[model samples]
Target chain A: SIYTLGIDVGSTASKCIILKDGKEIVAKSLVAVGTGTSGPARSISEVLENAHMKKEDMAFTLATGYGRNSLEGIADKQMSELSCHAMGASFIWPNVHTVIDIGGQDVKVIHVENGTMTNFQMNDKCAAGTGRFLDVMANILEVKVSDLAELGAKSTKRVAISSTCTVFAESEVISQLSKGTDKIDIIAGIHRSVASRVIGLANRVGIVKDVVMTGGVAQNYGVRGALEEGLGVEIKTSPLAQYNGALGAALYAYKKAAK
Target chain B: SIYTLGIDVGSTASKCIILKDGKEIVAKSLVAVGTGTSGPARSISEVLENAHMKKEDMAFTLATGYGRNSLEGIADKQMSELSCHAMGASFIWPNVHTVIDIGGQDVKVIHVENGTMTNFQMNDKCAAGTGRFLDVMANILEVKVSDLAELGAKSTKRVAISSTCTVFAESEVISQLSKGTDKIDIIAGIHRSVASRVIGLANRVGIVKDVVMTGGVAQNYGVRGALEEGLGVEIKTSPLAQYNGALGAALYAYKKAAK
Candidate 1:
């Protein structure tokens, strides 16, 4: 019985997954505690506990994401999130040519060819269209991040958000709110605004279909819809979307153990 | 003696200046209150009172800056800050060929040729390298903005701030503080960071000799030194730096009245 563990300590969340025989995902867990909170070890332990497996039972362990470098002693091997995301997306869809991963602190557009990353562009300096931006807006709207998944469904009218930076956009959102703009419309506009920003990055890398959208933001249908409309192409996302990075890391662990 | 008034209602402050016979700057006032505070009218009135002149005594009034459009009905003519800053810079430094105006919410780099603005680039989006960016960092450092002007002067080493966005740079500064980085080095790095960004804009319009720095940020000697070092040229500034926009508007008022 071979078990492989993968951990991804992102800026805002830590995700872990355990794979059995590198084919079946036996267990997975996500913690809101991020790398800054020193939460990777806790997430790894929790995921192992959920699978009823001891650390000694794991054949190999791998780590990736923003905190991958920090977990030097824990992870058997470390990999870049770019390669991990591409592998995971390709494994899920088997035909993914492009991957759009909007994480907490960054947005990445990765081009993949046959389960390998070829080219990529990332925006990690500013919090324009990343998960953190949505988190800030969610706090401003007084809504949970989960609630924002459908918060814009009722809106038919959308207001334009010109600012791409989070701080300025927050001020713009507040002004719109004060002007009696509908909450639904504002949320929709935010979704579109994020989509527009992501599209710019996507275009630079040149999006190719069978594109798969991954990361926490992929769960928001409003953002997904706007992205699809903006690109004029269909996007595929999996239930294990956020776990792509971890799953890829686990898969790499299996590969390493096999050798 | 004919008097002309000029008002510049910026996002962070409102400035008004009265010129006597369009040659001598008689009175100038800068209010901390911005246009959103409904302070333009009050700023103009206060400047008038400072000069012991009534509004009816003005021959013509001109307004400029972010809130210029909002001051409709109050300003006889409206002009763009780019042209105003150019005229004002050229007025102060007769040999001025370039203008760098770093304001509260925006930064502008204008190429001046014979007292006319030939080309200009303005950054109104994102708070990086702007006065507000300094304000945010000042709050974090628990220091007055003026203190920051000289804080970096004694530093022997400087830390690089790779992030150009204000919010991200704040995180970098906080992390540096936690890592026990020297505050003087950090402040010096900040000055360099702002100069780097401003230089990028200045280079866009092409930097020439006889450069003049305007706007309230010109008061920061640290920023001035960085700008001069970055451009490899001496930059001149005036005691009426903060009121340059208003002074330019007043100059335009005088020019318009003469016609």
Candidate 2:
């Protein structure tokens, strides 16, 4: 039995997925590539190791994200997030018509049509609407990512965000907190910010229906609900939400091998 | 009667006030400065025109804020916000021993002794404790500043801001709002945030009993209340809350002319 693999390098973390005879094994490893000396390659290597796999096993590999081109040797398909997200969404949530992938350093929106990507949009200038935004916010809140979602979802107070930059927004959040704002409200406010950012990207891609949200941030319930409320739509998720890219790559390999 | 003038240059508008014999007699004016402009001088000229006086009539002048140095002719005595705030509080409530000046761009705490400033502390970079953060939040809430105060006062639940940076806090506020966070809770959260920040700064400057609060933000009773609660002390305010800077400038002018 031949195995197929996919690797998606994100702004903040890396994901990998493996498929053998239609069974998909998904795993993700989060590592900081935050303008640090170590790059996505190290993260990719870590994810492969976690899955007990190597480069030779991957029949075809696709690279995606800001550091996509930098994935090196094993990368056979260097594609934008558009293709990866669409293909990734179809692998799990086949009914998914739209995808919101909030990566570490960027935001991507893909309108899926019949399991094929019809159109997409992306925001890469700042991490204000991306996973990194949440991370920075979590750092400020001194909470775990898992808690941010609950906190955000429980946030009953809504605040406005006026900055276009993540650094500026972080300052704003700190100021609000220092002024004695409610923790839940601050968390919710972050979700709204993420939603607005996702909305900006979603609108660009034209949200249809059966929308699926992916990326590391998708695990954050605050961002998920906030996006739903802002867009006035429902969002579906997969167990391999963060590993959709890897899963998609594995699926691609399976298709090629069968062909 | 020798008169002194004070000018406060802010991000959106500039204000100029004239005082004669330690009393504000000439009219004050708020002019459109609109970010990165010569609002200080133009506002002074406008106030002078409105008060039927020439800039030369002023015995001395004090300039403050982002546009503080713009008043060229007034031998602009650069008054530390702490000192100015103390002077302003003393003039407002003569028995005031502690003062807080929450401005559009910054927050200051002034410790007063016998109607004079003993020491002061300020946070120039964070917006959480400043009036500007509230303004940004107001825009997000689709409410006026006054409404934010009112809503905050009515909040039954207090939301704590977890962020220390004003920028991140603002984003957090927006996210909360999108998640259906309560407006009052969010506003209360902001009030608490500002109060905590103000108290932190005040602790550094040494807060005393009979606290008096000044500056444009002090006009918001919600934040004033929060400050009192945060510091576990009573807070007094000036009848001319918005004119504290001008009053301080005028008092300095009177002192300068007398000297």
Candidate 3:
């Protein structure tokens, strides 16, 4: 059996995955730390150790995500999170025609046709609908980021949040909270706002089914459900959603190793 | 001599100006609190008292700004800040062709022709390039807002900041600061960014010679100088720059009293 490693050093977190024989996932690890703080190296080592394998045991090493270039000496090859995510989604759901990735600092929509990426759009400059935006709101609401989905799920009504700028939106959220607006309602509004923004991007690229959601945000059922309703379509998410980029990188590693 | 009062309840501050007739400035007061608080009433009472007069002594009162509509039963009439800013610029410089007002929560560009406002654009929803943006940056840098201009002026080089979203920009600033980028260079970069955004609005409205800048941000010589360099034109600012909206309201009050 051949072993390959893929590391995704993202803006907010670092993930590493190891695959055996290019078919089954053998080991994986995630570190909730940003790219600049030795998080990348730690995640790689943790994953390798978890698999009981040394660096020499891996046939090839690949890296992806925003910090892909930063892993110069560690990765034998590098790829963008965009292509890697699409590839990973296609691998999991073979017929995925669209992929929506909501990472810590960016939101991206990819249009796929015939199992390959055809077009993609990204909101890399703004934080309005990204994971970081939700993280800020979660902090203000005094809840863990994981609790946002449950909080939003209990709401029957949503208060309107008009600003798309992250700073202005925070002020809006604070104003609503101070005015005694229900926290659940506010959370629901945030989810809807993010859904609306992602849907706008999806519409721009002309979304097609079956749509697969990838990235850390895909695990947030609040955002996923809101997006599904907003787009009038079901969103496919895997238990391995957060690891998709790293998985794709490992798949690529396997391909390079076989060559 | 006829006495008129103008009160401007801005998002971050309340300003009151008591004018005798239309030719001379009499008294002015500013309270650095938003209209949501008691700042507007306090400012008005303080300015009248400072002028050695009472509310009954004023012939007419006018209010203008984001909170103009909120000043029910406080002023005899209200006007849009766009018109007021144009009138204020014309009162200060009759040959003014462009007016840029960067307030606490908004940025406005007013185009003037024949001493009248012909067109205007406002960004009230976003906080970028506004006084509030500088206030947040000041908090991050641990300096008084008034000190940013001087700190920025000392820089011969500037670090580029590309994010237009205030939250993203704050993170970018923090990242740069952690990287040991000179504070002066960062401040200078902020000034340039604000200047670029305002200049884009100015260009959209068609820039003309003899530009006048008003509002609280006009006092920042770093921003003023950067704007001057970016626009390639001299910007006129008065000692009464921050009170321009109130002054304009007072001028309108004079017209109403005369009628």
Candidate 4:
């Protein structure tokens, strides 16, 4: 069996996947931090160690994401995260026509056709609908970011969050709290707001059936459920969502190695 | 002996102008709070007290801004802040052609002709180009917002502040600070970013000659200088800049009382 490694050095998290025979995720690891830190290398080493192998055991290595070029000495090739995401989503759910990958600092909606990325839209500049926005809101609420989904699920109604700007939305959330709005409800509002932002982008790109969500944000059930409710569709997610980019890279690496 | 009172209840501050006859300012007062707070009434009372007069002595009263409708039973009429700003700009500079009013939470660019507001644009939804953005940056730098202009001038060169979203921009500023980037340089960058955002709106509204800068942000020389450089115009400012909207309302009150 041939072994290949894929690394995704994203804006806020680094991920790695070790694939066996280009078909199975033999070992996968994620570093809580991304890029600029020791995350990229740590994730690679961690994943390699998890697979009980050394770097030399890999037949080919590939990278993707904002720091896609940063893994130069180790990665033999690089590809855009959008294509990697599409490939990863297709691998996860064979018929994924739409891929909504929400990462730390940006949001991407990809149109997939026959296991290839056809088109994509990204909120690459703004943080309003991304993980960064959720992180900020969680900070303001004095809660851990991991707990946001659970807390948001407790409220049946949400306070209206009017501002689309992250900073202004913080102020609005704070104002609502000051006026005796429930924290859980506010959290729900925050989720709804994020969904609203992504819905706008999704509509522009055209949401197709058999949609799959990838990236770290897919873990946030609050956001995923909100997106489903707002978009009127059943969104599919996988535990391997965060590793999609890296998985696609590994698949590509396998292709290069087999060739 | 005609006297008029004009009160402007903005999102974050309240201003009142007590005018005598058609052309003279009797007394003016400003309250640090506005809208839902007691700022509007307090400003009117303070201005009345400052002029050693009572509300009964006023021939007319006009209101403007977000809380314009809230001053029922006290204000004789209500006018849009745009019209009031134009009137105020004309009163301050007789030949004013355009008015740039950067308030606490919004920015407005108004085209003026013959002492009337002809066309205008507002960055009402976003907080990036407003005083609030500077306030947040100042808080991050552990400096007072009022000190931004002077502190920003201390830097000969500015670091690039790439993000337009205030929260992301805050993170960028914090990251820069962590990287040993100079605070003054970041402040200058913040000023420039504000100017850049306004420039986009101003260009769309069409910046005309004899431009006047009003609102509380007019006090920020850093922003004023940056805007002047970016737009390539000598923007004028008056000591009564912050009171322009109220002053405009008073001007209208004068006209109505005289009629």
- Error in Å for residue A56 of model 3: 3.4
- DockQ, candidate 3, comes to 0.65
Model 3, chain A: how large is the TM-score? 0.96
Q: Model 1, B111: alpha-carbon shift in Å?
A: 2.1
For candidate 2, lDDT tens digit of each residue in B25-62? 56787777743466666788888998899878888887
The digit string of per-residue lDDT tens for model 2 on A1-259 reads 6666666666456666666654656445646656564656676677778778887876666666666777677677676567767887887877888888886667788888765788788875445687777887889879897788877666667776666555567777887887789888888887888788789878876888788889877888778888888889889886678887766666665666677
Top of the candidates by lDDT: 4
On TM-score, who's better, 1 or 4?
4
TM-score of chain B of 4: 0.98
**Candidate 4: tens digits of C-alpha lDDT, residues A1-259:** 8999999988787889999999998999988673357888898889988899999999999999898888889899999888888888888899999999899889989999977899888997787899999998998888888899999999977577889988889888888888888889999899999999999899988999999889888999999999999999999998998899999898888888978
- Sort by lDDT, best first: 4, 1, 3, 2
lDDT of each: 0.88, 0.74, 0.87, 0.90
Model 1, range A1-259, lDDT digits (tens) per residue? 7899989888778999899899999999988773356577788788988999888899999999887888888888899999899888877989899999998878999999987899999998778888878987989888888778688878889698898878788888998998899989999888888999999999999989798899999999889889999999998897899999998999889989999
The positional error of residue A38 in candidate 4, measured at the CA in angstroms, is 1.8
Candidate 1 ranges with C-alpha deviation above 4 Å = A32-38, A154-157, B32-36, B142-147, B150-157, B180-186
Q: Write the per-residue lDDT of candidate 3 for residues A71-103, one digit (tens) a residue.
A: 998889998787788778877988898999998
* Higher-ranked by TM-score: 2 or 4: 4
In candidate 4 the C-alpha lDDT for residue A16 amounts to: 93
